[PDB]
Write an enzyme that holds these catalytic residues in place. Structure first.
Site, mmCIF file in Angstrom:
data_model
loop_
_atom_site.group_PDB
_atom_site.id
_atom_site.type_symbol
_atom_site.label_atom_id
_atom_site.label_comp_id
_atom_site.label_asym_id
_atom_site.label_seq_id
_atom_site.Cartn_x
_atom_site.Cartn_y
_atom_site.Cartn_z
ATOM 1 N N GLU A 135 0.903 -1.347 0.059
ATOM 2 C CA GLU A 135 0.014 0.009 -0.095
ATOM 3 C C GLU A 135 0.737 1.456 -0.043
ATOM 4 O O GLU A 135 0.735 2.242 0.880
ATOM 5 C CB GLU A 135 -0.962 0.090 0.955
ATOM 6 C CG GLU A 135 -1.916 -0.942 1.018
ATOM 7 C CD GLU A 135 -3.211 -1.140 2.115
ATOM 8 O OE1 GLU A 135 -3.107 -0.118 2.737
ATOM 9 O OE2 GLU A 135 -4.138 -2.073 2.095
ATOM 10 N N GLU A 247 -5.027 -8.167 -0.705
ATOM 11 C CA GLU A 247 -5.612 -8.032 0.444
ATOM 12 C C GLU A 247 -6.843 -7.594 0.072
ATOM 13 O O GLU A 247 -7.349 -6.831 -0.864
ATOM 14 C CB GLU A 247 -5.236 -6.753 1.444
ATOM 15 C CG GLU A 247 -3.851 -7.119 2.034
ATOM 16 C CD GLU A 247 -3.539 -5.944 2.861
ATOM 17 O OE1 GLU A 247 -4.250 -5.225 3.681
ATOM 18 O OE2 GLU A 247 -2.393 -5.757 3.419
#
Ligand SMILES: OC[C@H]1O[C@@H](O[C@H]2[C@H](O)[C@@H](O)[C@H](O[C@H]3[C@H](O)[C@@H](O)[C@@H](O)O[C@@H]3CO)O[C@@H]2CO)[C@H](O)[C@@H](O)[C@@H]1O
Ligand SMILES: OC[C@H]1O[C@@H](O[C@H]2[C@H](O)[C@@H](O)[C@H](O)O[C@@H]2CO)[C@H](O)[C@@H](O)[C@@H]1O
Length: 313
Positions: A135, A247
Site C-alpha cells: 500500500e 488483501e
C-alpha cells in the site's frame, strides 16, 4: 482453485511497527508452522507474509539483519513443506521509519537496494514471490512508478526470475486504479513499467466499507466487491497484464457473505487476468473481536468466512 494462487495473509511480523527493532514474541511474531499446515489443509497454496523493512534492514542501504532473515527462511521452509508459495510482503506503505520514499531521508534507490538483497537471498527459491511494497500512498503515481521500476530492475539484475507483485499508489486500491481526480492514475502511470524478466503482476487491494479502508465491518452492498474490481480487471486485460488481490476481507454477516461469494466468483470468471488472491488475515495475534480473522480457534474450529474461502480453494 481455478486461480493459480489462493490463500491468506499470516499477519504478526509487522505488528507494533513503531518499535525498532522490536523484540520477537513481545512486539511481533512469525507464524507457527501449524498455521501453514492448517491453511494447506483448507486448500490454500499461498501465504502472504508481512514483515517490516526496518526489521529486515535496520540501516538503509545496509546489510540484512540475519536473525530476521532467518525467521523469513524458517517460514519459507514451512511453506515449502506444505506445497505453498510465500509472498514476501515488505509491509511498509512506502515509508521507512515513518519517512516517505522520495524524500531526502528515503531515496527510491534505498528500496531497490533492499530488494536487490532479498532477491540475492531468494533467487533460487521457486516458492518465493516478491511483494514489493504494501500500500504505497502519499506519493504520486508517476513517482511511485519510477520507484517500482528501479526495484524491478534491481531484482532482475541479480538473475532472479521470481514473480514480482507491483502495487500502485493510493493504497493500491482496485477501485481507484483509473481515477484521475487528483492527477495521474495508477493505470496510466504503471503502463510505463518494463520487466525484462517478464514475470510481473499488479497487486491491488479491495475492501468493501464506505471508504474501502477495511476499518468497518460493513459491506456497502451485496455486489460491491465485484463492482470495484471491474475497472482494474479491464485494465489488466487491455494491457495484457496479470493481477493479484493481495488483501481483501469481508465481515461475518449475510450482505458481506454474498459480496464475498460474488467477488470470488468474479475473479474465477476472470481467471485469464487474475492470478489469485490472499485474504486479510490470519495469524495468532488477532483479538477476539477482529472482524476479518480466519485464524482457527484455540478450539480448532474454522472461522465463518473460511467456509466460503475454502470453496474457492
Ligand atoms: O485499503 C486499505 C487501507 O485503507 C486506508 O484507507 C484509505 C482508503 O484505502 C482509501 O480508499 C481512502 O481514499 C479516499 C480518498 O483519500 C479521499 O480523498 C476520497 O477520494 O475518498 C477516498 C475513498 O473513496 O483513503 C483512506 C485513508 O484516509 C487505511 O488508511 C489503511 O490503513 C488500509 O490498509
Ligand atoms: O490493535 C491491535 C493490533 O493491530 C495491529 O495493526 C493491525 C490493525 O489492527 C488492522 O486494522 C490492520 O488491517 O492490520 C494491522 C496489522 O498489519 C498493530 O500493529 C498492533 O500494534 C496492535 O496491537
Amino acid at each position: 482453485h481455478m486461480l493459480k494462487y489462493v490463500g491468506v495473509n499470516l499477519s504478526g511480523a509487522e505488528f507494533n511497527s513503531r518499535k525498532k527493532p522490536g523484540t520477537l514474541f513481545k512486539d511481533y511474531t512469525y507464524p507457527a508452522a501449524s498455521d501453514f499446515s492448517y491453511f494447506a489443509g483448507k486448500g490454500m497454496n499461498t501465504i502472504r507474509l508481512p514483515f517490516l523493512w526496518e526489521r529486515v534492514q535496520p540501516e538503509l542501504n545496509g546489510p540484512l539483519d540475519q536473525a530476521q532473515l532467518g525467521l523469513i527462511k524458517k517460514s519459507l521452509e514451512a511453506a515449502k513443506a506444505n506445497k505453498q508459495y510465500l509472498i514476501l510482503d515488505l509491509h511498509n506503505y512506502a515509508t521507512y521509519s515513518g519517512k516517505r520514499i522520495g524524500t531526502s531521508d528515503v531515496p527510491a534507490g534505498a528500496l531497490a537496494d533492499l530488494w536487490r538483497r532479498l532477491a540475492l537471498e531468494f533467487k533460487d527459491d521457486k516458492a518465493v514471490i516478491f511483494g514489493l511494497m504494501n500500500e504505497p500512498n502519499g506519493i504520486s503515481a508517476p513517482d511511485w512508478a519510477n520507484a517500482a521500476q528501479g526495484t524491478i530492475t534491481a531484482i532482475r539484475k541479480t538473475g532472479a526470475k521470481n514473480l514480482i507483485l507491483v502495487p500502485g499508489t493510493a493504497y493500491t486500491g482496485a477501485h481507484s486504479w483509473r481515477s484521475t481526480s487528483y492527477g495521474v492514475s495508477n493505470a496510466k502511470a504503471l503502463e510505463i513499467l518494463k520487466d525484462p524478466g517478464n514475470n510481473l503482476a499488479f497487486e491491488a487491494h479491495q475492501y468493501l466499507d464506505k471508504d474501502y479502508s477495511g476499518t468497518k465491518p460493513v459491506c456497502t452492498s451485496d455486489s460491491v466487491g465485484q463492482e470495484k474490481l471491474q475497472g482494474f480487471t479491464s485494465w489488466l486485460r487491455e494491457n495484457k497484464q496479470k493481477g493479484f488481490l493481495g488483501e481483501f476481507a469481508t465481515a461475518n454477516n449475510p450482505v458481506c457473505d454474498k459480496a464475498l461469494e460474488g467477488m470470488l466468483t468474479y475473479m474465477e470468471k476472470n481467471s485469464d487476468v487474475w492470478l489469485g488472491w490472499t485474504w486479510w488475515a490470519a495469524g495468532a495475534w488477532w483479538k477476539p473481536d477482529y472482524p476479518f480473522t480466519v485464524q482457527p480457534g484455540k478450539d480448532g474450529s474454522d472461522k465463518p468466512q473460511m467456509a466460503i474461502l475454502s470453496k474457492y480453494a
